[PDB]
Design a protein around this nucleic acid. Structure first.
Length: 194
RNA sequence: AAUGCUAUAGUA
């Protein structure tokens, strides 16, 4: 997406010659893909575009009558929040074909948000929106969320991101250290010293 | 004011 961003990414690719630099470019490309998907979903769903807002900020957003200092909320950053009919929905954007990666997120959010739900007495429902990049389709974890919007239709294809990722892999396919780094998260360790 | 991965005689 975008032409200036595409040019900046291409300039970053050409000068890149180290495994850590390539890993950083890959991480930023995945983050940009997530940003594209989140912005498009926010535009389609007619809700404000937010990303990783603090939970306590949401608490003061929905009910600005309780003291923020006294309340104790989990430090996770929800991608988005939606308040309707005395129910708060925690929205998390995911761009993967793996249901397991998002059910892990669902369980962690549920076990964390149950304390806040008892303390405030608002039932906190967690929804994870999942899109498969290879074939555009939308999967919703929460039945209530899909009930709120009878149809879920976005028109997005990640052809730009896939081609640049393929170019990056082609440049650094020989680099074994790069292949090790992309396997795990942002925390990178080199080859073992023994 | 500032923002680029390699930024690379003295003190105990």
């Amino acid at each position: 997406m975008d032409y200036q961003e595409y040019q900046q990414f291409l300039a970053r690719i050409n000068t890149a010659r180290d495994a850590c630099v390539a890993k950083d470019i890959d991480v930023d490309l995945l983050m940009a893909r997530k940003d594209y998907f989140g912005r498009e979903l926010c535009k389609s769903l007619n809700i404000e575009y937010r990303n990783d807002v603090p939970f306590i900020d949401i608490i003061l957003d929905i009910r600005p009558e309780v003291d923020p200092l006294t309340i104790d909320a989990p430090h996770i950053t929800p991608d988005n929040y939606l308040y309707i009919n005395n129910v708060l929905y925690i929205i998390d954007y995911k761009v993967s074909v793996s249901n397991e990666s998002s059910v892990i997120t669902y369980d962690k959010y549920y076990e964390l948000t149950r304390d806040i739900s008892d303390r405030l007495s608002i039932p906190i429902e967690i929804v994870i929106i999942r899109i498969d990049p290879v074939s555009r389709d939308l999967h919703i974890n929460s039945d209530r969320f899909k009930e709120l919007y009878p149809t879920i239709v976005v028109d997005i294809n990640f052809n730009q991101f896939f081609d640049l990722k393929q170019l990056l892999y082609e440049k650094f396919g020989d680099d074994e250290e790069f292949l090790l780094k992309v396997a795990h998260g942002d925390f990178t360790l080199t080859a073992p010293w023994c």
